[PDB]
Amino acid sequence: KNIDGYFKIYSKHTPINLVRDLPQGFSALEPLVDLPIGINITRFQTLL
Amino acid sequence: WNSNNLDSKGNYNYLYRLFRKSNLKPFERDISTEIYQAGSTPCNGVE
Secondary structure, three states: OEEOOEEOOEEOOOOOOOOOOOOOOOOOOEEOOOOOOOOOOOOOOOOO | OOOOOOOOOOOOOOOOOOOOOOOOOOOOOOOOOOOOOOOOOOOOOOO
């Protein structure tokens, strides 16, 4: 999320067992970084 | 501070936006080269 010049990140590297979709469960996501480049990205593309 | 004694020689390289279809939000930079269209007919990018 981009707020006040800050793109932000939150992550959990966490195991699951499911093929289909999000497994049900609850894990909070702590921040990792926040680069305030101030570049609104109304769109984005993953890289595979 | 004044740039009149340096930047002014005048100086066309310092530019401003004479028209925008709205008023900017905080720290919102409009870099779009789109012409300002005051008519209903498409400007098609040309004046």
